[PDB]
Design a protein around this nucleic acid. Structure first.
Ligand code: HPA
Ligand code: HPA
Lengths: 338, 338
DNA sequence: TACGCAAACGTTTGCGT
DNA sequence: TACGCAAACGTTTGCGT
């Protein structure tokens, strides 16, 4: 069709091209003439044709886990913002923690020739680390690890341990000594690592959380419901709960309510993520905030780098979590003795 | 690179192609040989090269409004599921109700040559109806209108009016006669149309909602907070509130709480959307459920049709909302007199 | 029986003059 | 000064034999 444009215009397609991408000087007269064509002809320059030549699609892929999840969801909208303002196109893909599903999108992606690869897989088994590294050729960053798992990728790191530690600390310094925890999947950084940070702060205070007081969640409100229920539903119960993430928290909240307990009056609860509307939880949720936005833009940024600046060596950037005091927490029994 | 494969293999690229797409018979012997190459050579067939020939990208675009929003978010994850299982690639794009932003992605999209176009723009001014129809050439469906605005598109329709009406009805039949409403943007179906459905049921009962009892929200919890606050914060207040959508509802909830009112003890409240975790709202939210999933798959489906079956005429499919009774509502003063 | 020749898809870009 | 010739990018596919 570029051939058609050049013809109504009586100029080479070579010309037509040039004006369309201001890649060389063209007489005004001519320049206009081209547009004239472009417009009546109702011309849309084929990006694939062009991609085929110039060798780059100007499009990138999000090999994510799932997008409905609050946490996720926000991280994405960010990444998207950055793609846009920097001309990039977004290819969203959810593997649902499914190897086959991953090997698939991974491939679809390579074939579709995405310029770089954004990776958010949550769990990362050897089997996955492997597939991932057969595409080391395509530039990519994994935006969800705690430490730098491989050498063939860039990494953004959240310090979800210092976060877990802040979480504990707060409770500790609030009067609390009988604490419970519902962590996320241990096969996940935001899961395991958060917990760990929490437990250190605890050992440091010689608080010993009883195993009957620690219940695994899956980051989904239902898991939160069940956990909290399991906790409060027992002879002896803590006065404070640390919840692996805000939506589970939102779950934990409900159940405590359905069991007629008061938050934070009867049970204090602190979560983690600082999700968009945790402030409208009831009560307004006190949590640890994860800089999802920065996390996103910081990821785009590294990728872009490797991309244009053709960087080879790996990189890793740390991002930092911070306490947000809302109102789901209250002074514990030992506050006055400190 | 296909040329490279055919060479290690000592066969025509023509061959190589054929085996890769089982498009004609190839001697086993040969067939294997090819793979052999494909594999060591570590070959990934270029989809763009191929797209250039076969004329179809096998990829589709979501010209959406925003993706973090609960409602939205879910609709998307659906659409994505369907793209995947049907080989399609997803291009997510948020125009944020910004014309320029829209004219942009719209174009990026056409140039990128998406096979069909999924449209979810929320507000739709003439200026937008126009741009949209300059791409009538690219197959597309708008999955967010109440009636069929244009003739150059397919349409999935939600009956958000029958929904608004159900909403009212419930309240009516529960003992309620002093009702309030926080609707979504009137420039939106889920906004206006829901309201309307609500108001009819009201006129039908000769309930007259006082204008000081109806407050616009923007579908965001903060708007909900403010509205509810505005309502309950006044001499005379209703005994029941209909909330244009679940997250705003979640907002309305909080504020009522911060004003020491009880839900549904002091104020009954019913929302709309039936968002993924409205069950974990506190109290468990009673709302109108919107079949987002079906809405999604139903959209993919129509598009696919036009796409493969090269359908020209427009179509429109209706989907239906339904009452979900949770516990944010209680019998009003007139329940016994019915 | 089983496979190749070669032109085409829609652009970009180096050497021209 | 201001523009074209023509080959190339990586595939697919019709006519062959
Ligand atoms: O894996 C996760 N899923 C959902 N929310 C989360 N917040 C932290 N990690 C996660
Ligand atoms: O426009 C909307 N935004 C967010 N949630 C919604 N639920 C219905 N309509 C909307």
């Amino acid at each position: 069709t570029i051939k058609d444009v050049a013809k109504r215009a009586n100029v080479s397609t070579t010309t037509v091209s040039h004006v369309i991408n201001k890649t060389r000087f063209v007489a005004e007269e001519t320049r206009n003439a081209v547009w004239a064509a472009i417009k009546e002809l109702h011309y849309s320059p084929s990006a694939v044709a062009r991609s085929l030549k110039v060798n780059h699609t100007k499009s990138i892929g999000l090999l994510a886990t799932s997008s409905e999840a609050a946490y996720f969801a926000e991280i994405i909208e960010a990444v998207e913002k950055n793609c846009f303002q920097k001309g990039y196109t977004l290819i969203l893909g959810n593997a649902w923690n499914n190897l086959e599903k991953q090997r698939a999108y991974l491939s679809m992606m390579a074939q579709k020739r995405v310029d770089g690869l954004l990776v958010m897989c949550s769990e990362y088994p050897e089997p996955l680390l492997a597939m991932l590294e057969e595409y080391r050729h395509i530039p990519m960053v994994v935006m969800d690890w705690g430490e730098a798992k491989a050498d063939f990728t860039d990494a953004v790191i959240d310090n979800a341990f210092e976060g877990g530690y802040m979480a504990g600390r707060y409770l500790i310094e609030r009067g609390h000594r009988e604490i419970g925890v519902i962590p996320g999947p241990l096969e996940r950084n935001t899961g395991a690592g958060r917990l760990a940070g929490f437990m250190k702060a605890m050992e440091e205070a010689m608080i010993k959380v009883p195993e009957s007081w620690i219940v695994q969640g899956d980051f989904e409100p239902e898991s939160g419901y069940r956990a909290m229920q399991q906790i409060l539903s027992q002879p002896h119960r803590p006065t404070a709960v640390f919840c692996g993430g805000d939506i589970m928290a939102m779950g934990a909240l409900c159940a405590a309510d359905e069991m007629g307990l008061r938050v934070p009056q009867d049970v204090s609860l602190i979560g983690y993520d600082n999700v968009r509307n945790a402030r409208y939880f009831t009560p307004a949720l006190t949590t640890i905030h994860q800089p999802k936005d920065s996390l996103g833009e910081t990821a785009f940024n590294m990728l872009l780098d490797r991309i244009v600046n053709k960087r080879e060596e790996p990189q890793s950037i740390e991002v930092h979590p911070r306490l947000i005091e809302r109102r789901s927490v209250a002074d514990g029994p030992f506050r006055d003795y400190r």
